[model samples]
Target chain A: ATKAVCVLKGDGPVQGIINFEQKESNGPVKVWGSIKGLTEGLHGFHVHEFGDNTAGCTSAGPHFNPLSRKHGGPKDEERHVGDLGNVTADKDAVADVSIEDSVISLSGDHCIIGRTLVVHEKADDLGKGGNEESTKTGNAGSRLACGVIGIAQ
Target chain B: ATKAVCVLKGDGPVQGIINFEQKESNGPVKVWGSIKGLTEGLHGFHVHEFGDNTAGCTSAGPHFNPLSRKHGGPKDEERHVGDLGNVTADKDAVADVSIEDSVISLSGDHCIIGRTLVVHEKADDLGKGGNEESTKTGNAGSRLACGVIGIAQ
Candidate 1:
């Protein structure tokens, strides 16, 4: 199996680690992560447009919407390949979630290696917000935390 | 003049605006910016490896070290073109610095358009940290802010 890892950091208290594992080059990938120091609520999470974090979270660009689809949850039929959905934290402000995604692979155009993962400061309305930024950014507020995807041993 | 801009944002209080202007395509470029909400000290600043900020500042990758030269201050003869040295903030936590650079351009391999600008949490030791990471990253601490270079009006 091929695997990759991303270490997340931010100026705020938010911190976490994510892992991606694929059994085959083009096969479905298993994504999982445990995050800490988040507000006790739903937070919008997605792959961003760039892997660059040189200037903190905002430099990561917008959501990775290569297909130009509307922003939606992980289960939505119409969504960006980077749209992995939200991560809900408990009262203690911790979250551990895992899921298998078909749209993401370890290789090819769908390859997420060298991309970026971001945790937003607000809940993603999942395109439910009527505003224009909703369809464009899921109305995710300021970036709270971010990390870069890299190859792992 | 042909000009470009990079707007920086971060999880911290840091925020700023940067502008790059060139009177000639291959001539020296005038780079300047005003940053606010920073600590009253020197902060590491530079161009990053990738323009993709999908994940925030870290996703911007390493310094724009295309020549793979050892890290040094902007004035050093042998330094990454991306290394623009430090930006000193006043007691009021504001920084306004300007300089002309010879190695950067808006066209050709040295072109900075579509790249990223980053500010670090700590002062860059300028390869004086006496460690491997020093040569690579100048031992700059956490990324505090970032932005992408774009065509300016």
Candidate 2:
């Protein structure tokens, strides 16, 4: 089994840590993370293309879409590999959620290690919006926070 | 049937482009790129772990070593997935080369899309140098330039 962790950072008041645990090589990846300083609403959460933050969260590029699929929810079969859906923050601007992802793996073509996990300022419509960007980025607003995935002991 | 491209960028005088072609799901990836403004010598080239260059090339992190292997040449069985050996520049600091890589794919665990391609200031010793960093970074010096892998039409 292999595990990975990401320490998210941002210029705003938002920040947090995410941990991924894989019990088997091809098994579902268990994602658990707690974030602080977000607006009280649903936020788009995803693994971005670049880990480069030299230009801030924008440098991380688009969402991880190795399959060139349209942007969708975490459970959507046609979704990007990085699409993990939204994470809701409470009134206190904090969020703690845990879920199992089948598309994400610790190893293989779907591996997410070293990529950037991004928290968008607005909720991702999950490709439900009729706008052009919806299919590409779910119309997720500007990135508010991001972190690079790394190997964990 | 999928293809990808990376437009290499840097703070130095060196700049160029790389194209990746994959014909099958698990087929060999054909790599070809032309670079200019580099020193007339051998330079280390490899796929880095993170595409994040927020801190410049260093922010891209280490080599793409998903298997946790030591740093070696592209041909070494135990080398990092990012190792692609050295690229040589002519007297005019221009390099145009094309080669086939079995380890890199457009899809699957060894996929190179969405990662980063980095050009080093010095030659990668192929982990032959009798030192610790050699086995880790192949003695590749400062990052001369870098670019993120992107899906190509």
Candidate 3:
């Protein structure tokens, strides 16, 4: 399987290591990892446009919108390729990351390599927030922690 | 005066916010910040070439050696422009950054606005580490935390 690792870093105490693995092209990308220091509850997660985190999470740019899709949940057919949706954190302020997505790949045309994976402060409303910004970002508030998805052994 | 900020992030618990302030062109750049989660002692620090840290400190490249100078301490005239010497971490593992440099600027020639500030795992021997790598990197060990210098209000 093709594997990639993202070393999560942030301006705050939030930190973690997330891994992505795919068995083959066009197959689901299995995501699993652990993030620490997050407040309990849901947090919006997605792939941002730039792998650059020079200026902190803000430098990663907005959620990747390659095909110009609206913000949505993971199951929605109408969602940005970056929209893997929200991840829940336990009462211990830790988020156990685990997901499988079809929109993102390792070696296919829509590969997310060199891109940034960001965890935002607020839960994503999944485009059903009934407002303008909601459709654009799912209203996922401030970015907390991020990592660049890079080729890993 | 011009000012900029870089949010230092890393794979580990090391994190902080660094600020750069410059009074004018050709003047020294003043740097100050607080980075925690360091071991008690000296840590190699410098400005790296790329501002992109999507891949953590490794992706930031070598020191910003545009002048092709030999690695040395900040006091030495024969040093890389990125050479700001070492930053000491106290017993609490908090590095208090306070530097004034004449070589780097926020604007004009030799600007570091889009470059990266890296904190290494070991002390910088100021090109006198008695090894081949010493002349180039001052024997600074692995990067622990990094941030991109970007415009600030």
Candidate 4:
């Protein structure tokens, strides 16, 4: 079983952690967890690079995609490695984004074992469903909240 | 000059647009103007993946980091493409983050002409300048407000 930890910090009065697992399910990697202490609405979310958690959480680097792909939908043919998609919040202002990815490895060269979690201020566009030039990433906006992905106990 | 349009929607009732330019001093791209209709105070901000503006802005996607980096101090190395640093707000809870980037290209393969913006409920945790992981993104927490990035003129 593969596991990872996510530490959220900041004045959004932000604080929480999430866990991920790479099980034998025939679907994408399974992820389940909760991030608490957010304000009160939907926030953008993703996995980042580096995983350094230093400089407050700046060391995470960029999205984990060293492939240099285009910014389109998560399932696009030309998407970045770290593009896990967005997360939405409930009436309580909290978001719990989970997905299963066959392309997302847990413990290998392509492993996002040590990445980061990020929440943004806007939603993703998904490159208008592949019609636009940038169709790999969802086209979400702003860097509202951020955190580092780590090895959980 | 190239241009984009933005609109806001939702319960938190937030929205807006930001224009990106390539100023000589800042680098390849610069944000000339960002106007948002928000409620109030230190909302988080960033560039999202999509531009659909549907689902009340939830369809935009992830942060606009074609480079796939990590969260950092904006001054840190290997920063995420969504790492625009931080944006502050006045007593009215409106924050307009403006800046330019040398690496962010506005044309050709490096164009981020059409993107979105999101606001969080809290502040970013700029590293304390210690710990190896301190360089990670400021560990910002929670989602507050959100919008899109558009053309200025």
Better of 1 and 3 by lDDT: 3
Instruction: Identify the runs in model 3 with alpha carbons over 4 angstroms from their true place.
Output: A1-153
lDDT of 2 by residue, B1-153 (tens): 976666677889978888888998888899998999899999999998765555667767888877998889988898988899999999999988687888888788887655678989999999889999999989989999887665554
Question: Can you tell me which runs of candidate 4 are displaced by over 4 Å?
Answer: A24-27, A37-42, A57-59, A129-139, B1-153
**Candidate 3 lDDT by residue in tens digits, B32-110:** 9899988889998899986555576887888987798889999999999999899999999999999899988876677
lDDT, each prediction: 0.79, 0.82, 0.82, 0.53
lDDT of 4 by residue, A1-153 (tens): 655445455446555555666755333566666666665665546676643333333444555676777665567776676676666667776777676666566555466543456765566665564455335435555455554443332
Candidate 3 structure, TM-score to reference: 0.56
| Candidate 2 Cα RMSD (Å) | 6.5
Tens-place lDDT digits, model 1, residues A2-79:
776666678899999888889887789898888898999988888876665547677777777668887887889898
Classified by CAPRI criteria, candidate 1 counts as incorrect
The regions of model 1 sitting more than 4 angstroms off are B1-153
TM-score of chain B of each: 0.95, 0.97, 0.97, 0.67
Residue-level lDDT tens digits of model 4 in B1-153:
443323333456454444555544334665644444554555445556543343434554555666766556456676656656677666665556576565555445544433445555555554554554434535544444444343332
Pairs that collide, model 2: A51-B51, A51-B52, A52-B51, A52-B52, A52-B53, A53-B54, A54-B54, A108-B109, A109-B108, A109-B109
